[PDB]
Amino acid sequence: SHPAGIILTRDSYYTIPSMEELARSVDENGECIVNGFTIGREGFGSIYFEGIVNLTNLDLDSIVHIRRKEVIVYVDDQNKPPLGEGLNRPAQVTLDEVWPIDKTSRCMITSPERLSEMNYKSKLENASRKQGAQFVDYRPESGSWVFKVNHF
Numbered sequence: 001s002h003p004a005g006i007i008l009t010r011d012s013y014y015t016i017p018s019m020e021e022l023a024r025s026v027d028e029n030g031e032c033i034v035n036g037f038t039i040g041r042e043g044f045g046s047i048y049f050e051g052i053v054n055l056t057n058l059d060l061d062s063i064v065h066i067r068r069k070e071v072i073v074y075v076d077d078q079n080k081p082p083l084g085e086g087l088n089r090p091a092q093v094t095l096d097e098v099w100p101i102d103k104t105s106r107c108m109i110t111s112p113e114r115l116s117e118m119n120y121k122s123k124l125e126n127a128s129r130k131q132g133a134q135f136v137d138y139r140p141e142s143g144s145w146v147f148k149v150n151h152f
């Protein structure tokens with residue numbers, strides 16, 4: 001019903017504070033509450049939640065999915081807590097390797113000069129804007145698209 005502990009077991013996923021540190025961070029009431037929380041996945045991206053976040057017994061393996069050019073936080077609208085609770089709250093998403101594909105070669109375009117010339121960053125920025133997100137950055141070296149959302 002209410003099994004104890006944060007669940008995150010999948011390869012290349014990590015938290016900040018680390019899972020080791022979060023296990024040491026349960027308070028006298030039984031809650032794990034941190035000031036600033038990141039969940040990331042090496043090679044794919046990360047999600048930073050500023051402020052006071054209650055992580056108590058969260059099944060991050062079920063809730064969080066950091067994929068190529070996509071994150072999913074709560075797979076089913078029906079399992080999502082009210083706004084402000086859990087991870088359904090403002091966050092900064094970083095997606096790595098957001099590079100366009102050359103349509104002739106079907107290889108990714110990673111040249112910063114070619115990306116600048118086409119102003120690829122502005123394509124990502126307008127996509128963020130039209131989705132109601134706030135564009136933060138596009139770092140061409142790593143293909144890192146950074147944007148803020150108000151919730152998931």
Ligand SMILES: [Cl-]
Nearest residue numbers: 006032056057
């Ligand atoms: Cl916990």
Ligand SMILES: [Cl-]
Nearest residue numbers: 046047048094
């Ligand atoms: Cl980051």
Ligand SMILES: [Cl-]
Nearest residue numbers: 106107108109
């Ligand atoms: Cl490629």
Ligand code: NA
Nearest residue numbers: 009010011061
């Ligand atoms: Na997996």
Ligand code: NA
Nearest residue numbers: 044068069096
């Ligand atoms: Na990615």
Ligand code: NA
Nearest residue numbers: 048092093094
């Ligand atoms: Na981020």
